[PDB]
Structures are given as C-alpha cells and as structure tokens.
C-alpha cells in the first residue's frame, strides 16, 4: 500500500458552501479524493466523532503528524467579543486556527471567506471577521477564492498538490495562476456582443433572449479573476453569465462592498464596434439629410 497525506479541515465563520462545493467534484469524485488521494483526518461536517471524541482526533492528528499535514481552512476568525463570535470547544475559534496552523506544512484558504472575508466582513463587519492571512503570517497560504470556488477547480488543485507533490504557482495575492491567472471577461463567450456594443438593457428583453452581454446589467466579469467562463460550473453545465446573470465578482476581495451588483463596472475600456459605426453612419446620414432638406 501507500499512506495518504494527512489533511485537517477546520471551519470558522462560514456558510459551509465551500465544503458543499468540494463534494460536487465530478473528476475526481469527492469519494475517491477521500478514499485514495488524501487522508481527511479532521472535518466537522463529515466526521463520525463529536465532542470530546472529535477533540481527541484533532489533538492526535496535529501532534502525531506535526509539520506534515495540510491545513484546509473554510470560513474565517472573528476578532470581536474576544473571538467568542465563533466558539469551538468553549474557546475562541482563533485559538484552534493558530494551533492547527502551527503544525501545518502548508495552508489552503478555501473560498472568499478564508481568502478575503466575504459576506460577514462586509460593511459594517459586526464581528470583525478577518481573513486567515491577516492572522497567520508564518506559513504558505494558498488562496482559492470564490463564493464558493468551482468544485472541479478545488479538486484539481488538490490533485495537483498530491500528484506533483508541491504547491501550485501563485500570483502576488496567493491565488493559483492556473485558474486565477485570467479574468472572466477575458474568456467570456459573450465578448463578441460586448465588443460589438450589444447589451441586455432590461431582464428578458430580446437581447437577453439572444444571450447578449450583461455589462450594462452590472456584470463584474471585467474585474474578476476566476475560471468560471472556461472551466464552468457543475461538470461544465453552466456559469452565472451563461444562465443570464452578470458576474457578482464573488472571487474578488470585498466584492460585497463594490456597490450594487446591478451597477456598471467602472474604469473598464468599452467602445463597441457596431455601436460606434452605427453612430458614425447616422451622424453622417443625418448631416446630409439636413443639408438636402429631408431631415428627421
């Protein structure tokens, strides 16, 4: 046989959407990840042991496999109320996080929560929810953002680290280049319409029924790094834009506080080819029609 690499999966303030995403994996199935690629040694959502039995597992794993396990973090620690906005075993969650990170070889920050702060960190951040990298400063942290990240992206990152026995290459922000190297807008199948100046202006208009661009409906694709437009969601079935809603920007830091989702993105170059050339033509056609005297 062969031992699998020990994995400790802890939860702070979260919605458990990231865990849900993980088990959606089409290839490899989450079943096979757990069975054959890794040793998921601690995970509140799935484990049989509870209470003092769960505590014993936790202690045993991080002690036995000290320096050798991967710490996966879902959610984030609150700094408010001495950390008692999130209580684990009668103590501040942050204490668990720190204790887990001290023995980890590397840390995976699942989702926008662990990466950035996500919804609980939005104005006014009642609990002072804080991303992991602001609390843990002495360990490699791989940020895998998104709310949640794409299921198959999650598993691909796991399989990469198992197969190639190393961390994925990352940007200046700690995101894996492989899936976060480009923008949604740079691989969007509706760019043709964007580039032509063909936009949905209101829900279920003729533009919407032809799958025109959603830029004027607030799509935050132009400023969002993720794989949704190429890799797609749920075994490549769809992604937000394909089903008719603009990107919310859910992979980006503080995206909740970047104005309304239905407000246009700013500082994104946008000059339509057919929209501009139609204007140029009518401007010229109307100048002539005025001089000839067949105006209107």
């Amino acid at each position: 046989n062969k031992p699998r690499i020990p994995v400790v999966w802890i939860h702070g303030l979260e919605c458990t959407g990231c865990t849900e995403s993980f088990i959606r994996s089409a290839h490899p199935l989450a079943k096979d990840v757990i069975l054959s690629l890794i040793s998921l040694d601690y995970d509140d959502t799935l484990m049989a042991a509870a209470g003092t039995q769960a505590e014993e597992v936790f202690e045993d794993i991080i002690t036995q496999y000290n320096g050798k396990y991967i710490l996966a973090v879902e959610g984030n620690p609150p700094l408010g109320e001495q950390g008692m906005f999130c209580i684990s075993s009668g103590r501040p969650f942050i204490e668990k996080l720190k204790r887990a990170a001290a023995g980890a070889s590397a840390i995976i920050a699942w989702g926008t929560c662990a990466s950035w702060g996500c919804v609980q960190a939005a104005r006014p951040n009642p609990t002072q929810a804080t991303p992991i990298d602001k609390v843990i400063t002495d360990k490699p942290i791989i940020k895998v953002p998104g709310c949640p990240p794409i299921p198959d992206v999650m598993s691909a990152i796991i399989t990469y680290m198992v197969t190639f026995d190393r961390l994925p290459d990352v940007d200046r922000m700690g995101r894996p280049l492989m899936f976060y190297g480009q923008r949604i807008h740079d691989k969007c199948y509706r760019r043709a319409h964007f580039d032509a100046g063909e936009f949905v202006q209101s829900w279920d208009d003729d533009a919407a029924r032809k799958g025109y661009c959603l830029y004027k409906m607030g799509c935050k694709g132009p400023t969002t790094y993720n794989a949704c437009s190429s890799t797609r969601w749920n075994d490549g079935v769809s992604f937000p834009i394909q089903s008719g809603h603009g990107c919310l920007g859910c992979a980006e830091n503080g995206f909740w506080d970047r104005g309304s989702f239905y407000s246009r993105v700013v500082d994104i170059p946008q000059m339509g080819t057919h929209s501009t050339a139609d204007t140029v033509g009518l401007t010229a056609l109307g100048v002539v029609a005025a001089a000839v005297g067949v105006h209107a």
Binding site: C15, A48, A49, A54, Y262
Partner: protein, 581 residues
Amino acid sequence: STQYETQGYTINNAGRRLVVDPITRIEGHMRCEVNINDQNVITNAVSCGTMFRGLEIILQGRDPRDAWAFVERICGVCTGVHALASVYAIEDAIGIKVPDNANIIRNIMLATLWCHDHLVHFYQLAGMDWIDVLDALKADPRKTSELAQSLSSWPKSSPGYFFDVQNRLKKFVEGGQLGIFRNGYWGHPQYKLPPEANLMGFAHYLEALDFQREIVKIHAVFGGKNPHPNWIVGGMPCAINIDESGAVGAVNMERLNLVQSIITRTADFINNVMIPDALAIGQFNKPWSEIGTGLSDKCVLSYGAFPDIANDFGEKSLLMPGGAVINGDFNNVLPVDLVDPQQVQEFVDHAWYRYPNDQVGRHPFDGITDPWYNPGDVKGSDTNIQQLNEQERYSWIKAPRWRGNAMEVGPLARTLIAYHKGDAATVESVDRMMSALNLPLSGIQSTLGRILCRAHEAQWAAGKLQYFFDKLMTNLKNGNLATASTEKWEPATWPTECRGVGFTEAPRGALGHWAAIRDGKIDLYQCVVPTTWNASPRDPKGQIGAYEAALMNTKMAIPEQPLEILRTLHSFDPCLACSTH
C-alpha cells in the same frame, strides 16, 4: 441545583454535566450540554449556537435588489432558499408580480434543493448514527446482496459489488488512516443493524455521495451555479428561447432536455435507494419510534410553500400546506399570519443579544439584532466556557415563539400539518409507510419519525419536480415564454416607504424574511430561520425549544459516548449558520 416544570417536563440540572462541543455532522457551530441522573437519563438539555455573522446588520442601507445575494450566503447547505425568501419579501414590499414561468422555475429550484439536501443529510450527516461502518467489514456479501434485492429494485446489488465495497473499506482502514471514521462510536450497543445491513448502508452512502452532484445540475441550468445560484427581483434571469435565432444564448430545448434527464435520475435514486434504506433503518431501530418525541406531539408549525398559482400565497395555491398546532390539538390546525405582531415573536433573555426589555418578544418588523456577548459565570472565563449558564444567556440563537408557544418545525412538523389538514396524498403516503413498519401513526412523532418524514419528503419533492417541469413545457407549447417582470425594477417606481414578508418551507422548516424599504434602501431586514425555531434557547417563561425537549428523558447507554444525543439532534438536521445568520 435547580428544578422547574414546563411543557410537561421536569427540568433538573443536578447531577453529572455532559458537554458535546463541537457537534459534528451538522452545518455550522453548535454546542450541547446535558445533565444526567444516576439512571443515566437526561434530566436537563442545553442547546447553544456557537457562531454569529450578522447578516441582518450588513443588509442595512443596501439596495433591495441586491438583498437575495447577501442572504443566500446565510447557508451553503440549504443554498438558494434564503434567496427565494428574499425575492419573495422584496416583491411583497414593492408589489411586484412575477410571470408564471418565473414562479414554476423557482418552484423547481426549491424542489431540487429539497431532493439534494434531504439526500445528503440522510447519508453524509445522519447516516453514521445508524450504520456501523466498521461492522460492515464483518458482513457476508452474498447475504448483503440478498438483503438489498429483498428490499429494492435498484440495479446495483451484486455480491461482487458488495464484496468490492467491503474490500475497498478493508484496505482504507488497514493503514490505520481511518479518516472520517476515526475514534467513532462503532460497536455501541445502540447500533442494531446486522452486518449485511451496514454494508448495504455504507455502499449506498458512497453511491449518494457520488450522485448528489448530479441533482444540482438543475440549479446550474436555471441559476448558473450550485452552491449559491443566481436570482432576480421580478422573476429569474434565465431567459428562455426555444425556436428563435440566438437560442444558443438562452434556456433552449437542449437545456431543458438536460433538466428532464436529471429529474428522472433523481426520482430513481430517491425512490429505490434512499426510501428503502429509510424503511430498513426503521425496521431495525423500532424502539426509536418512541425516543425524542419532544414538541412534535404538542406544538408544530409550517408556513407553507410551493405556490402553484403565481403570486398567490393563499391556501388554495400552496402545494405544501401551512398551519400551526398547539397543546397537542391536531384536530384544530390554526392559520398562520406573518404580519400579525402577536404570532411570531423572538425573545433574547437567554440569548446573546440586547433588547430595551428582554422580558418581551419582538415581531420581526420590530426586530432588533444587537450583539451582546454575555455568558455570565461559566465556571471558567469569557474566553473559556467550561459550563454554560442556562439560567441566563447561553446562545447566539434568538428564541422564536408563535403566540407564545414553543414550536417544532421541519419535515415531521409539515407532515403532521399536511396529514391533519386531510391532504389525501400525505394521508395515504404516511399510512402506507407506517403500515410497512407495523407502527402506529404516533410512531412518526419521534427521532426515527423525523428521518422517515425527511425521506418521504424527498420522494414528494422528486415527484413535484416532474409536475413543475411539465407545467413549464406546457407554457412553452402555448408560446408563454416570459421569465421576468421589469415594470417595477427601477427604484423610482417603488413606494418611498414599504414593507413585505417572504416565506417558504426550507428543507429544515418554516423560513421567513421580513424587510422594510425606505427611499430605495433597506431600512430593516429580519430573518427567522427554521433552526432558529428548533435550536431555540429558553424564553422568559422558561419554555424549552424543540431540541432541548426532544433530548429530555433520553436514556444513554454510555455517558461519555453521546450517540443518543447525536441521533436525536441529527434527526432535526441542524443548520447553525441558518439559525444565527
């Protein structure tokens, strides 16, 4: 030592104190504490939500049209339900009517969630309470095959197959890396399945873990992605185009074909794997038809769900009946009104929040979410809870009451409501299902009954999927394609000041969003969530919530191994992020 009487229970916190923290195989963070007497019987039960985020605070000042996206992130397990409640609320406030197809699709989104959520809970969350995974290694594959083939028409049942499953499991553990099975409760005397039944159960656990990913593809088609699909105020953003140019950019025939293929497969898995497994657990755990009754024979609540008539939330429209029963009087199902300030109210005298007067309950339109962490003397410190003080404030969960009554919500509650309202399908279904176990109707009011009702609901939802899909296609055949109303999309068309209620039945029970709009911005947004009801702390009368009631008078075979506590709690399907939000 204190002792008092409530709802027929004698609450006594003398004796040995047991702490289960963390509660695992649930969504989010929960702590439970109990007291047991010399006979190892629970005499006191304490339900504690150990997390808070504060969505109700975060939504203040935002645009009502964005609300759904924020509140959807309340929970990734019951993903989508809060968004549905949200658009319901905002459309209620402004006075928006959505097109028929938008309603049907939303119904499909909800039914899909019911199917997925119930399935995953049954196996991945509640399952290992009933299935002794390590005991499966002792089974005989040939009889496992016989057992499975005696229960169901499911194809996957060969001796070779079960042998393969047992073999992988054998290999998995042989290394000492037991993973999620480590330090479990395997061998506990309350594990009653024969080895063959455990192997059948575990095999299905794996099959369910695989298949569940398929179900949510319906969410991906209509809502872009799962978890956390997309929605709009005024309908759905998934424009439909069947027969016109550019159908490649919308919900087309091919897209709907995919949806149809998932419906069939979902109904197939639930009916022939989950259903027989649910009955099977019932057969080998019949004493638990009498354990963890709690409030289910006294007080149950449902708001109702699945409006079959678009924009009509009346009794003639909701396919899932609403109503309340109190004082065990199931012959008088009472109507529910979410505007009435005298029905739904929330108390915080035993919760970590602040009111001007904590001795009174506040209707969500008068709701206040003011975090105040104040645990009292907990035999430790503010950052070290050794023992919660249930005399005072002990939870991040508010205490909802209906007309002052503590209620149970969820699948069992809904089933009782639907049954006693005389819904023919439910009556037949329950009757049939209980007949098969040779159990009286009262047997449903229990820990086992909750699990049975959950499974039956999945079957019910799977059937509804097809019904809704056919309804959609019928509209398309008639040239009715509209999926959004934008007449009132612009804030300029809204009343300067308005309020509304959005309600539905989430997988775990009655969900409500209460929203006030002023000058195009959210003024107040209050949520009362199902687990908020069930995991509720006590009120000024000292009345206990559904969890604490269900745990009362429970016998424990081994005090240090809280399998019984787990079984009862898990039967409720706790979602703690939902409860606290």
